[PDB]
Design an enzyme around this catalytic site. Structure first.
Site, mmCIF file in Angstrom:
data_model
loop_
_atom_site.group_PDB
_atom_site.id
_atom_site.type_symbol
_atom_site.label_atom_id
_atom_site.label_comp_id
_atom_site.label_asym_id
_atom_site.label_seq_id
_atom_site.Cartn_x
_atom_site.Cartn_y
_atom_site.Cartn_z
ATOM 1 N N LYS A 1 1.092 -0.887 0.438
ATOM 2 C CA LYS A 1 -0.225 -0.112 0.016
ATOM 3 C C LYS A 1 1.243 1.311 0.391
ATOM 4 C CE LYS A 1 -3.691 2.624 2.142
ATOM 5 N NZ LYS A 1 -4.454 2.668 3.354
ATOM 6 N N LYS B 1 -2.723 -1.368 -3.677
ATOM 7 C CA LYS B 1 -2.695 -0.305 -3.137
ATOM 8 C C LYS B 1 -1.619 0.830 -3.290
ATOM 9 C CE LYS B 1 -6.116 2.591 -0.517
ATOM 10 N NZ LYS B 1 -6.984 2.456 0.905
#
Ligand SMILES: [Cl-]
Ligand SMILES: [Cl-]
Ligand SMILES: [Cl-]
Ligand SMILES: [Mg+2]
Ligand SMILES: [Mg+2]
Ligand SMILES: [Mg+2]
Ligand SMILES: [Mg+2]
Ligand SMILES: [Mg+2]
Ligand SMILES: [Mg+2]
Ligand SMILES: [Mg+2]
Ligand SMILES: [Mg+2]
Ligand SMILES: [Mg+2]
Ligand code: NA
Ligand code: NA
Ligand code: NA
Ligand code: NA
Ligand code: NA
Ligand code: NA
Ligand SMILES: [Zn+2]
Ligand SMILES: [Zn+2]
Ligand SMILES: [Zn+2]
Ligand SMILES: [Zn+2]
Ligand SMILES: [Zn+2]
Ligand SMILES: [Zn+2]
Lengths: 323, 322, 322, 323, 322, 323
Positions: E199, E247
């Site tokens: 992320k 992400k």
């Protein structure tokens, strides 16, 4: 293999000389050393080179004298670098293929006197151009690739005619290995080896060599920043018929040596260049580094995967090994 | 895209200098380990018929021959005691006797030649009446974990005698970790362990049995198996071995090469009694030139071995020195 | 199947723009770490003859020079205290003195320049009377585990002083995990550990010994060994290092490249005193152009290094800035 | 390497800027940026493009004006895209090789004024056909491969004649790189680089470019679903003599960039296309995304392995980098 | 050795049938996960200006829209509660409130649509007054291990509510193992953990912050780093994650491809709010055709993703169904 | 990645349909299906095949009727296998290239009626020789390689002339792909695909096909024991210009499929042959296996790496998928 301290202690093998010796991964031997040598035109002539302390330019007779001992030490080969009289330079580099140029004469003399010693001649136009660039210039001052090759081919043939067992094209023209190989084959020089300078960089480390021989580059020599490009260089040269491939400069490019050896599994050489020699020797002379750094520097080339090393330290190293 | 006639692989072969330049491997004396057969007693020297030119030596005689070995630069010896028949037992207790041949020889050599490497053999077969490589259960099967207990005591005894390397040759599972733990626990932090990792159930061992005065398919590896050897070596590295070994040698060069390539660890190989015998016999008959000795040893270097246990170690060191 | 003349590798070399487009590596100031020699006292500045243009500085003077380093964007310094001879001992206790040079310098720098990275050296050689990298046993050998105990106390002392990174340079086995455990146990959860993983027994260190006022073959690595370095780094990653380092530098670029390729972890390299000296000497003699400095540094980037410990860090940062 | 929490905490390096900087794996620099530019036929002319907010079509004189600053910013190269007057379109695409077409004129003007700036011309027939398809149509309306190549070759030669250092064939005809290379070589244009659009997809992301230049595709451009196919495309183009290879579009194909770089280790470029620019710029203008997303988008291309990026953000990025 | 004109890669492109035969990837509805913004209250529906066509829904309204989602075959929803400002605190205690929005919504959905997958978000940022992804220390830094303690209680609360998957989005080190241990200890043996492994600290998240009513460079990853992501995912797999996620999405497709290739594990990717916004904006302006939506999603399949968290999930499922 | 129970429980993803669906690695779709079909010479003719329950030989008109529904189901392509009248067989296999042979006629009829449906013709001499061997025999009864190719080339050209979009050489002559490709290119059939039967084994699984079409082999078809050999087969065919490569038989050779896909990353097809169909269908009919085994068998080909599957189950599978 999940090796974990304290079950694995990597110091144990290091505890004693005998175990250090048992696991030692690489050894330098005299089989690995190639001595470059600057050759003058005269008789009874030696010159000291300011930026290469301890290295002399030698006339042919002097070369033959010193070579007895290089041979006695087991040094397998020499790489000849002539020091062209200024009067023999020209825009066409014709002295390159003169049958009585320095290289050609030195070669025939050495082949006759020391038949087992390898002779590696330099196929390059920079020692022969009035301007010093590695080839024939166009109107813009750019080094013409294919026109320079034609000269190089005539040079290489002249070397084979003199008896050289290896020709080493150092120019960095594209396609030259294949053109030279074709010519050698056409001419019947079936067994003349071609030692390509495959990954030759645009380096600051060549400074002293210019002083040694009496002589932009970024349009033909490689950018120091590039690694992957060196593999493409090598690949072409092997495909074109090189028997050996070389990286130059050397220490500053040990990663390249390792990638080249790993990728191609072919006979790989490396040049410990004039500037590398100068910086080591200057430090040793200033008392800043121990003489043991010579064998350390050379051991690094073996460790990295080099089969052979062009080094101005070859005689000193051979001496040290023989002890 | 290398293609004839642009590429002619003969060119580098044309001259000795070029052959030397491109030569991929060299044998040196730093690669040689001499196994030795050690007798009890004094002034004993015994020839082995199946190993021409090799003698079993009592300790005093070993010390004498060792002067030459050391002078030649041989880095280490691998000691193999020739256990008196009366000292063999069900419990293999002579294996950890401080006064056993191996322990005495170790102490003698460590004192007389402090830089010489001594590799002791950790194994129960020299000490059992039945000759199997461990302690038997009531079905006649070699018990793995109980045998390790004896091996651990042996290994500790070798460390106490001063051995720089112990070489477990038993083929018990897990023994490298057990020996390592014990060494560590005892403060023997720098005793190397040279695991016989891939040791095959081989017919090549015939002469050694002659030499030391002694099936193994439930512990020694099946000659047919190659992947299995990687699993063997991976475990021994995980368990703390400092070096790993393949035995026999030349009939298993593919194994050496796989082991080196996979693990990049210090890799050793044993050119066994049968190998030495074959070569000697052929040389003595005039069927092979003496050059085969250096050829056989070069093979091991080429395959990836760092060190070679070989009864040719003196012959080869002499040839290399000169 | 790239082949001349369809492929001519000179084409991208023809013009600066194309050379820039295809350039595979760039050095930036974010890659540079400046090692510094720190003296006790006030107003002290000492030139090092074997390292032309480098000075040992007392803390007050270091704070002054650091203004410029920070202005140039150099991310971190590596502190090397110059221990007074009287503070060296058998037990190396000055290593963990809260009032030692390293701890004082750390505290000073952390306060004055909060964004500057400080990397302290975890090592006992600056503090022993004998100069060896640890505590000796009665045979004169550096004891691994006892030396770690002292190293752990040193590392904790550096963390207490505010160092963001500790760099164990000792070559003790297992020390990265022991230091990590200690840091964690103490609540120093974000102190980085920069392991000197592959540190060789090298002749290139000569001048540093001059600079800090001080064989190592039983702990430092054999120059001949390359696979061994992978094993070194694998252990240090397993043990919790945040970055791993190769030392020396340029003579070991193959190692850098192998380490980066194998582990894909943050990889650092030390261009040592001997390397700096060689280059400086040649530049001062007019044998090499000053351009060699950026060439040498670019090499490290090309080989795979993320960061470079170099005494050229200021010279290079100035050249890059401009 | 058995790295396990809490011995390994990947946050430690992230704790401070200085350590973030030390371990940062990739950096974007101005060396990485290529600015595409839409070139009009007139004098004193600029036009705004509705679907590319902030990008202008520029006549040659205006191009020369703006280029002073692109040069000053260090942008290495431009990629020229002419905006062909409708009256100059035809079924034979002959305007492609007109020596006084827009591209040719812009090229000569820029080569003269800014000799160090790289010029990458577009070798493509779609700006020149009355129908707008990337080539010459047969009776069925299919784009003829080998016939389109013949035009492309004449175009590329005309670009080299104008002084372009790089020609970039964007057509997706099979075999075109080799045909162009052969022609350049035959003609003596030894050093003209060929930047192949190797993996060019049949993408919805090109919408705005059609608006910019004033202009089925699935029979020549690649299916978006295909990855492995891109490696075969590239391989052919390298074999055919490309100096650089390109993936287009860009962000939506970052995986392709990474596979191409990894597989070939050759100079790899990527095109952040008109639709990528439009969607970013529209979001920035709507206040939906921060301007920092520009450098983030460009950093992704470096991270993925691109050596260079064709991007309409090149000037903004260069400006941001120079701070 | 494929070479033109023997090889012409256009041939398979000539006809739709051949294009279909050779098509390497297909998107299906089985690949789609719909994130949803959940409001407290009843009868609430709120448009998000920066995410055109997406609404925040109270639970009753969510149940209504979910009928359609289920009918379309969407396998799972990812719930994102929109925490009332008054329920945010220093201690983030609303994260584990059995009566929190997420827990209530979970219970409601599990009952009404038993086959629909529910993925809850394990994260403290929706619940802190300061908005940081954890509990702060006295220097304002997010404490890793103390934040995990709260995350563990949250995750347990989600499991108690019936969530089949918990998705830790926090970027705390070690949190996957801590949550796993807790789940196991509690008897939640089949609760999946969908780790947000890689992320990044990204500008693409702008609109989500709008949507849920809320720098991160000391926990979220540097966009520049790719090798680092492999280390992230390796740890999360070791720690027990059942699926791993990257992400943002499209700006990180290289990461998706590296992660799939390295680990061959269930790999997910989040096409974030910023990505949706960019695409929507351009479509609404007539700058891009609506076909870009399926193109963007196909990219994720091509890069190696098994599943895609996307606000286009309904639009795409409708297009696929037809 | 050190995944260990109970931290890793591989059952968790299996717990619920939705998670099974999320992690499911491969899906079969109608894009993956190719229907082989046995074509008779007459009008209003269908024949049942004893050893292939449920499969009919169809005259051309009947083929056109059934094809409406194959098209409606989304089946992308058919593979035609003519059933040669005995009177049209000969030692020279000339019926292979007869412009009004069954294959040629079926092809033109289908190309006209269903322009989007792919037609894959069989390039093979075994349906046309009086003896049934896959080629022209010498005096010893051996199948002559290069002489058989000449016929095959004439066949393939005749298929392209009839409008076939793909020709599928199934013969296992060495070198045939290149000879066919050269001929197609010379003739201007630029876009006719060649689907090589690259790794075609000497298999017992073909038994029913002989019954279907109305027709030693070990000197040309591959030994079942050989795997590595299949990679060499494929490599040659790609080099020779194949657009797609195929393994036959299918299930019994799933390992080959996987190695081929992994090694070449090229469009890879697999033939679920007559004997595979017969054994599945016979078991389903005997009540020994559930009908679900059809989609399981086809899912295996996708899982193994096949892009497309020649299967007599294509219509049933398409029907099942469409539910
Ligand atoms: Cl047992
Ligand atoms: Cl110790
Ligand atoms: Cl913390
Ligand atoms: Mg004289
Ligand atoms: Mg070259
Ligand atoms: Mg074992
Ligand atoms: Mg270590
Ligand atoms: Mg004006
Ligand atoms: Mg192409
Ligand atoms: Mg993590
Ligand atoms: Mg009818
Ligand atoms: Mg074949
Ligand atoms: Na050598
Ligand atoms: Na050795
Ligand atoms: Na860096
Ligand atoms: Na670049
Ligand atoms: Na999926
Ligand atoms: Na398919
Ligand atoms: Zn030159
Ligand atoms: Zn035994
Ligand atoms: Zn030290
Ligand atoms: Zn076009
Ligand atoms: Zn958060
Ligand atoms: Zn046949």
């Amino acid at each position: 293999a999940n090796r974990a301290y304290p079950y694995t202690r990597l110091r144990r093998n290091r505890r004693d000389d005998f175990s250090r010796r048992l696991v030692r991964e690489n050894v330098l031997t005299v089989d690995d050393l190639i001595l470059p040598v600057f050759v003058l035109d005269g008789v009874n002539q030696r010159e000291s080179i300011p930026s290469m302390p301890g290295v002399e330019r030698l006339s042919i007779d002097q070369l033959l004298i010193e070579a007895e001992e290089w041979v006695a030490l087991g040094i397998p080969a020499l790489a000849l670098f002539p020091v062209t009289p200024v009067e023999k330079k020209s825009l066409d580099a014709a002295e390159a293929y003169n049958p009585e140029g320095i290289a050609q004469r030195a070669t025939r003399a050495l082949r006759e006197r020391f038949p087992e010693l390898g002779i590696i001649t330099d196929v390059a136009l920079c020692p022969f151009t009035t301007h010093g660039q590695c080839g024939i210039l166009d109107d813009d001052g750019y080094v013409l690739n294919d026109v320079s090759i034609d000269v190089l081919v005539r040079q290489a043939l002249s070397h084979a005619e003199a008896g050289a067992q290896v020709v080493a094209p150092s120019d960095m023209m594209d396609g030259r290995i294949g053109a030279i190989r074709e010519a050698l084959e056409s001419a019947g020089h079936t067994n003349v080896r071609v030692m390509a300078y495959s990954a030759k960089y645009a380096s600051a480390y060549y400074g002293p060599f210019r002083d040694a021989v009496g002589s932009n580059k970024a349009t033909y020599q490689m950018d120091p920043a590039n690694s992957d490009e060196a593999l493409h260089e090598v690949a072409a040269d092997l495909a074109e018929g090189a028997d050996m491939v070389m990286v130059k400069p050397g220490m500053p490019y040990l990663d390249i040596v390792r990638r080249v050896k790993d990728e191609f599994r072919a006979p790989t050489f490396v040049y410990q260049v004039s500037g590398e020699y100068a910086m080591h020797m200057g430090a040793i002379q200033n008392g800043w580094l121990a003489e043991s750094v010579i064998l350390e520097s050379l051991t690094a080339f073996k460790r990295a995967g080099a089969d052979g090393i062009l080094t101005y330290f070859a005689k000193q190293a051979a001496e040290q090994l023989r002890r």
